[model samples]
Target: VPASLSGQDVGSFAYLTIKDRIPQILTKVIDTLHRHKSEFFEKHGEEGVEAEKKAISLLSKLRNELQTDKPFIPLVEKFVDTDIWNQYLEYQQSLLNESDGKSRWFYSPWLLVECYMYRRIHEAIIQSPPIDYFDVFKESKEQNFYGSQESIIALCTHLQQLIRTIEDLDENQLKDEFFKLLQISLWLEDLKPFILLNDMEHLWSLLSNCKKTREKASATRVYIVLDNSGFELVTDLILADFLLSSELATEVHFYGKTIPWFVSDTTIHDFNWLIEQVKHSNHKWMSKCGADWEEYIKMGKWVYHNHIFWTLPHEYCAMPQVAPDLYAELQKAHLILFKGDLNYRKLTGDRKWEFSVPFHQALNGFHPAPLCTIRTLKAEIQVGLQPGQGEQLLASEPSWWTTGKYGIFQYDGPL
Candidate 1:
């Protein structure tokens, strides 16, 4: 048991997000449903129209429930993953034993409620058969990827030149190159407004150490738990390519969600779609890099995995007990990089720690390997600050924790 951030405390970031951001997200979801009404009707006729009506009614009611801070509800409809969802709901409910086993929206753990919202989004769709597999957010994802075309072309061109001479570069040069690429991937200008903290020095040290280890007997295996889909995915793919081309890792494995989640979480569909876009791009470097990635997949040097456990609300601390296979697989990696804010939140159990708590302590024994979190601070629940740092920021920059203006490159694993 990892400790969860208490949303009952008004001072907590979790509380603020539940009160503010969560409702905004619900509104956007409803709008998306409305935008797709014509498409639904065209595909499934009267049945699609009815399903659309029902889903909108249910989602609208859900919005009200969340806005009014209603009590959490278990799934009443049966779906393939209903049992799993219900079991987790029960687990969450059990956590509220002191409250007579009742878990309400704003009063419950932020992690539990936030994840539940995404699950409910899925519930709304799957109940409507023909459109069950449709990705309502797909258009936005494509727009984002296309919107960053200039940056994508530039990064891919840079990578193309780097790989051309990768064999001549020494270990230090390769390490420096990796760091540069990591920075570019993380600090895209458009995303700068959302970043407030960055810990690149710590990340560089961790990757350097992993590189040294790879110089020994066998090739080091690197794992990345992916985050967003659009420009972020492009950067991630580039980073993975660098790892293999520079011989920093013998193999690179990617972990993504099996379902559409959290507005922008990477799914297998998104992953493949990105590759296809790059492969067909008019830019030579971008297309070439894309082709190389496709070949890497064919050769099995690059692998993609999706486990149901990722979409569930359980913290990584519960991995061994709840998702043993994924846990065991993670143990083999020399370094596992968890990307984005949600991953950071889950990694730390979304706990409102006293800032100076050691990163490992916040993890509460969730370490499966040499793990590093590359995250922008989009929510409060941060740890691993120096003495008085939290208070200092709170006084000087009140929004430092919740504004995506800061980022963390924290690492804790076997040394």
Candidate 2:
């Protein structure tokens, strides 16, 4: 499959993301920084004020550079990932000769440029020592998790009921119930916008085929590369618990971010924080789930991991080359379920492919195991649709491509 480039043609999603979405993101980021100005001063005194100003100024300049469609520039700051970032820039630079050295804001690959923007934002704060660890996006995450209390409680209650019922089933019944619960747990929000394009039948068939070959539930290992943190995180935990409680999987490994990312991606701290919040909640079901989750971690049934490679811009195809250990590590899983959009982007190399292209082909040989993507469409890139399906949607619903309203549970790799 061919990779999509921004500004290769006007009016493309890549083009619009560069021209519109990115600048708007920068504005919101700057606004967030401004809102925290007093808190910065309160904590770090004069240095905090100075650091905040520097970060805002840096982000503002970055915004202006994008607005003016400036040529891509290498980050000058030294961070833990500085060399990795520079190496990636070199790789992209090698591609520049083919693009006529036009690796500007709107002229490069959309995924590369988009990932670079976030890295640059991280650099903006990292360069300012006093605020190096501060997450400008922290408030939104906290507010989102705290705001979804009722949903969290309800999901916990449902999970409590499911856990109580799971032990009496046979293996076949267990698998069927697992899939049913999995499908039900697929979404946590309102129904108006959430549509699952590719459904559980594909996944169930894949798992059933696996179960036939590997007879023991203890032999099954499931890996989840997680997504957002608030309610999304709670639901993910519930699903992870269900998988083990139903004996569908012996162990569930959760991969989260090492750093604060993409506004609300789960970091190791976020994962721990969610458990703590639930454990302390006044509601019994919520606290029960939280307690059970904590025990799962201690018993090694549920494992949490943070690899720096996850925070990088390189797609999964680069894992073997750049993070071989992580690639080797994931190979042990029987099923790897990649959660949410950014992981989906990395799984498929974030390339714009014809929607009908087989999902495996879009993977570009990144498969370490049988994998499934449980993702809502939040970006322009997608694959694994029938012939003419995307065109039909494009004709009927202009915004469906990037709206979180539509989702897909696309599966690929070996049975």
Candidate 3:
């Protein structure tokens, strides 16, 4: 229940009550299909395309049933980790058995969180009366350029031309783009260090050496932790493509939350929906671009996983510490790029502090890896700046404090 959703925005919250608006959003998704139904039928034909349409339609109806908040089991269910889901059920039952806490409800685990969130979304569609078809997937289509053919084609053509100029596939502009994205990411870290692409040599060199130092270091993996929807994921995927194609990295991991921790991160069903859209869409450029990315993912070059702990901001580092296997997985990477504002907030434990605190100090030794964060400043926690730089910024651009206009592409070692 964020003020953003409730106060001074929309009279009724976009997602005010968990039960009310979610089902409405689910129904809105059906309208999304109806709007696209003709083209889908023509391009994908009767059997396959119609089946998807029916599935969407059914989800909408199922949502309507849940709107009553009558404790109904959803028709559509997604189990992330089978064992984990069972453990969660047992843990919940134990909580019910105890009945000692404030509430009787069982708190959710991360992987199962995704299932619950989507279910809530389905329910929201029922609670909210009016369906907003236009706003639905407004960001998704923008990401794929799904409905924007001319713009997407133009972008792809430009990308292809830019790639060609590099000539030496071994040494090319792709490196620079990767570096630029990396720096921009760091810029978002805290707007400190004012580090540019060239400044990242220290980190780059460290990683390059790490590549040689560890013979079995689980193949260089760049985990792009997700955040809000739209162009952000698109940009990250572009970075992923470069990483894989340039052999700068062998694996790209996308870490999503088990719940709707952030809007853009892929849920299991979201990933599947995206795959289906990309495969079935007739938009040539959209098809080609998505197909290319999908090929990498399908080949196991790219992997996506959602962990349950993500929704609970206070527990991120502790969860990794508790889960040895997860900790080991994090240790295997050369760099972990935590994306967007919410994540930045989580990384620092959401502690209240003076704005000018150092990034490392703010972290308080929650170092997971040689990590970089790419986030547009939407929350407080900022640190690691040069002397007088913070004061100067306050005077010069008062709002530069949280505005994304200024960024910090920072690189720091585990000191």
The top-ranked prediction according to lDDT is: 1
How accurate locally is residue 387 in candidate 3, as Cα lDDT from 0 to 100? 67
List TM-score per model, in order.
Answer: 0.92, 0.92, 0.60
Q: In candidate 3, residue 118 scores what lDDT?
A: 54
Q: Kindly list the per-residue Cα lDDT of model 1 for residues 311-401, writing each as its tens digit.
A: 9888888999988999999999888989988999888888767788888898988888888888877887778888887788889999886
Q: Output the better candidate (1/2) by lDDT.
A: 1
- Over the stretch 28-140, how does candidate 2's per-residue lDDT look in tens digits? 88999899889889998999989989999999999998999887788888877889988888878787666366577777777788888888899998998799888777778
- Residue pairs of candidate 1 with colliding backbone atoms: 194-404, 194-405, 195-404, 195-405, 195-406, 196-405, 196-406, 197-406, 197-407
Root-mean-square deviation of every model: 2.7, 2.6, 8.6
- Where does model 2 exceed 4 Å of error? 169-177, 188-196, 205-218
**Per-residue alpha-carbon lDDT of candidate 3 for residues 1-415, written as tens digits (9 for 90 to 100):** 0111111122222223334544555665667656765755675566535555555665665565445433223322333333443454455345433433311112222222224445344333333322311134545534544544464445444444544554464433545655755653333346444331133555456555554565664577777777643334555666676666655678888876554333345555555555556446686655666787788888989998766555432334555654557667777777787776667666665444455566766666666678876666554446676667767776987666455655544544652
Model 1 TM-score?
0.92
Worst 10 residues of 1 by lDDT: 191-200
Candidate lDDT scores, in order, read: 0.82, 0.82, 0.53
Which candidate, 1 or 3, would have the higher lDDT against the true structure? Answer: 1
| Model 1 regions more than 4 Å off | 1-3, 97-101, 188-217
